[PDB]
Amino acid sequence: SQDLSEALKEATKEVHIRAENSEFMRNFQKGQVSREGFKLVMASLYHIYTALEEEIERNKQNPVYAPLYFPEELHRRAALEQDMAFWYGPHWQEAIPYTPATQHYVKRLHEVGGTHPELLVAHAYTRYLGDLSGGQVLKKIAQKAMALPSSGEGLAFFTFPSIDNPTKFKQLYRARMNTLEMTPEVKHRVTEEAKTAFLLNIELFEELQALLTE
Ligand code: HEM
Ligand SMILES: Clc1ccc(CCC2(Cn3ccnc3)OCCO2)cc1
Ligand SMILES: [Cl-]
């Protein structure tokens, strides 16, 4: 049939266009982004990734994910912790927010990681394949807007020190992604979960936009 890496690209091209042009994003690309909303986004990602990576570890030995286990090159938890200490200070752990939409996302992550590990790959895709495609353009909007150092403090999340060429790594990852055992049943559910992952995102951005509009 059709390769998984391309079945997912197709299955999410529509919803990607709705997320890329959601209100919050539309605002971010306008350079209009306060420290307040940015910290909000970063804190939320910290929870999302802490959940995703905690589940990837639980299933790293599992053949439904194993081929994609790249902690040293992809994982964001460590980088996000550095960003949390930078934005929220030393005791950020007891100061960061945990909004409802974020909880919904984390809840789903644990469900998949605990009971539908074969779908776990739909979330690594949505999250990591995305981070290797445009954390370059938005990175620059951020630095400009808030006056952040080229050195990287406060933007650890956006850097990949162990990956030289993200485009090339992304290609490798796609190929590896296509070596996983796939059956109609699984290929169907996996792409379906990727659309859900996008919606959880779109929902999260609508919720943050709401909060910021005091
Ligand atoms: C600030 C709004 C966004 C912009 C401007 C943006 C832009 C892009 C661009 C330019 C690409 C690469 C295009 C290509 O394939 O040649 C891309 C890929 C991707 N984006 Fe976004 N994106 C945005 C938001 C999102 C969101 C909210 C998600 C979901 C967390 C997301 C998930 C992805 C994924 C999964 C890919 C890789 C698809 C693939 O190549 O198979 N993006 N994005
Ligand atoms: Cl404000 C904000 C919101 C979301 C992120 C996260 C990662 C990311 C990764 N990504 C970039 C292009 N396509 C996906 O998702 C959307 C924009 O960047 C950073 C900053
Ligand atoms: Cl939608």
Care to describe what's here?
The chain has 214 residues and is mainly α. It has one domain (1-214): Up-down Bundle (Heme Oxygenase, Chain A). It has ten helices and no strands. The chain has helices spanning 4-20, 23-28, 35-58, 71-74, 77-88, 100-115, 120-134, 137-146, 166-177, 184-212. The structure holds protoporphyrin IX containing FE (HEM), the ligand Clc1ccc(CCC2(Cn3ccnc3)OCCO2)cc1 and chloride ion.
What's the SSE blueprint?
Elements: H1 4-20, H2 23-28, H3 35-58, H4 71-74, H5 77-88, H6 100-115, H7 120-134, H8 137-146, H9 166-177, H10 184-212
Helix pairs in contact: 1-10, 3-5, 3-6, 3-10, 6-10, 7-9, 7-10
The chain binds protoporphyrin IX containing FE, the ligand Clc1ccc(CCC2(Cn3ccnc3)OCCO2)cc1 and chloride ion.
Protoporphyrin IX containing FE (HEM) is lined by residues 8-9, 16, 19-20, 25, 125-126, 129-130, 133-134, 138, 198, 201.
What is the helical fraction, as a range of percent? 55-70%
* CATH C-level category: Mainly Alpha
Q: How many distinct folded domains?
A: 1
What series of H and E elements makes up the topology? HHHHHHHHHH
Major β-sheet profile: none
Number of strands: 0
Give the termini distance in whole angstroms. 50 Å
Structural class: mainly alpha
CATH architecture: Up-down Bundle
Coarse morphology = globular
GO cellular component, one term: endoplasmic reticulum
Binding site for heme b: 9, 16, 125, 174
Site (Important for catalytic activity): 131
Subunit structure: Homodimer and higher order homooligomer. Oligomerization is crucial for its stability and function in the endoplasmic reticulum. Interacts with FLVCR2; this interaction is potentiated in the presence of heme.
